[PDB]
Design a protein around this ligand. Structure first.
Ligand SMILES: [Zn+2]
Ligand SMILES: [Zn+2]
Ligand SMILES: [Zn+2]
Ligand SMILES: [Zn+2]
Lengths: 199, 199, 199, 199
DNA sequence: TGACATGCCCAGGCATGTCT
DNA sequence: TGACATGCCCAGGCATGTCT
């Protein structure tokens, strides 16, 4: 069992928050975000664009870390890992096969295994938006379904995104729930309806 | 891809056939056999008793081999193995972790990996029935569900039981289909009803 | 997992059979036998008298062995042992603390752990009945309840009694089911009624 | 028999009190707290989150200790230990197999056996809440059911949580009753109804 | 001896990747 | 996109040592 990183929102002095793209109505759209649930629904190994928005410019050398933790109290102290089947399959060259979350399209990506907690994380440099743009987008990939036997095993996860200075100070923190599934559109609509009818 | 052992019934000069125990009506009974389908339905890692019946006594040194093959033509040439999750879990001390089929309660069990075909099999000596008894019973275990991702992946298998002399001559061959599943009683009654209504 | 001793009745050339005493009607009588079920119901650590009847006199040096096996196919290959709580408690001086079945009142008792199967058994010399008597009685004790967690765990057992010559030849074999429980009278009456109503 | 640690509430100069999470309505929810009974109902080996609330910040080096005692006067002087079955089973690497209470997800956990009283306790450093949060949460696990034969044996326990400075001074003490059981929701609703109807 | 105890058994139906 | 798949969740009630 491992000590649990905080998931508490800390928008901080830089006004850090996340944004998500709108997507289509298909039963099996690749990535769709529910604001009511603060929850991403996405397919295995497909791009999940996450926007980073800030009110003030972070200092040079700021880093963006993503980490998954189990959402339920009963599972929080268990490290989130890829299942043995997917670990044994699809390497991009940098991500260790045991890591659930990857970043695509970034030459400065770093995959970390915490020496004390054993938890996995993936870090890229923070880059400010281009001229006229309001945010910076990172493309994450989740390499197992929420349902994978021997991995997440139908346990919901949170992704925690932290903005950190080069010294390691926490500048901001946000999180979102993730369901990696075959039919994100179906499952988002089911969970939203259950929220309305039974929540 | 691997060459495919015969599944053709050969009751042979010893009159070799299989028998199966009757079991209870529970939705999740541990092992239940359908004569109409020639199909065992059983749970993961639970005992599956298979009876060996002969009309004539096999010679000393006769051996009994069990091997799984996929039933569908499209999958026949693929070796049946345990999935990575269950391989990484439950060793009894003798069975290699990759083997699907084990025998319990036999000190002379041998687990074989074919040098040419890569197929797994498990062998025990043939023992004649005790006085007054009509058959000999072997207790097999199947160490994955038929549905296991990265293993059988919802593909039906046959188990091929061969009676072999010590020289390697085939004396008899029988086979039965297997579904390893959580609810053998439910699934047997579903498959028998589908046979009657749509077969 | 361990190879399974035969439980098949073999009354043999000596006409070997078991007999049991009649007992009282109390809900918690110490030992009561159901002929309809061929099943002893008895309390923990209390005397269970078992009679040995023969038609012909066994040879000098004949031995009487008792051994427990799980009755259900799914558990047959598991060695029957005392639970950790009762193992750690009540030694008579001869019985190893892991043995379920003891014999009381016999100076020539031998407790055996099979080198290959790991199964426990308890052996006493066969003694012919005294003049005018028809049988010989052995007093067995069962040192766990059928329900004990970490031991029998609510799994029914059979006791197998074998008559063996000094050379090791099997002269006769009989068996009976056992439920060790707090209320043998209650439980016998429940199981007999269930047999009549639902069997 | 062992001297009995105090269970008297002492909220102390730091205003120390416990808090508990709300949980779902399921018959077998993993952990549910009854304010009317000051009683946790939880399952074996599952996470039990306990919140530590203070009004004033404890000094550096403060420690949080948990210990179980039997609630009934007749059993208070008996040390609460794991039963022999569960002791012989599930080690996390740090907890001795005899200890009932474990802490998950803390690298600084210490398991203590008192030299004089023989009582077990588990200690972690006190950490103040993160920014904006009102409490600190510890995840305890209870490694036997209240009913375990040879352990708690259906005797209710209190868990005593003490806040202690590094010098050993008692800063605060709170306690709650615990029932570790298979069906916490069922049993909580039974005990609350008995309180209302017969208390 | 009656009846409470409490972990477990059991059937109904949700789950969710995949078939069509 | 509709609907089958199939391991799992869940509540009702049996279990069985013990309390009275
Ligand atoms: Zn996976
Ligand atoms: Zn598997
Ligand atoms: Zn016992
Ligand atoms: Zn226990």
């Amino acid at each position: 069992s491992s000590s649990v990183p905080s998931q508490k929102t800390y928008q901080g002095s830089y006004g850090f928050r996340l944004g998500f793209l709108h997507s289509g109505t298909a039963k099996s759209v690749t990535c769709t975000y529910s604001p009511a649930l603060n929850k991403m629904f996405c397919q295995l190994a497909k791009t999940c664009p996450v926007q980073l928005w800030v009110d003030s410019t972070p200092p040079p050398g700021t880093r963006v870390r993503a980490m998954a933790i189990y959402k339920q109290s009963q599972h929080m102290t268990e490290v989130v890992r890829r299942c043995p089947h997917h670990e044994r399959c699809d390497s991009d060259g940098l991500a260790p096969p045991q890591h659930l979350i990857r970043v695509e399209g970034n030459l400065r990506v770093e995959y970390l295994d915490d020496r004390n907690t054993f938890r996995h994380s993936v870090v890229v440099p923070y880059e400010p938006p281009e001229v006229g743009s309001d945010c910076t987008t990172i493309h994450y990939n989740y390499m197992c379904n929420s349902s994978c036997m021997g991995g997440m095993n139908r346990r919901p996860i949170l992704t925690i995104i932290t903005l950190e200075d080069s010294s390691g100070n926490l500048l901001g923190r946000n999180s979102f729930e993730v369901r990696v599934c075959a039919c994100p559109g179906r499952d988002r609509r089911t969970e939203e309806e259950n929220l309305r009818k039974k929540g």
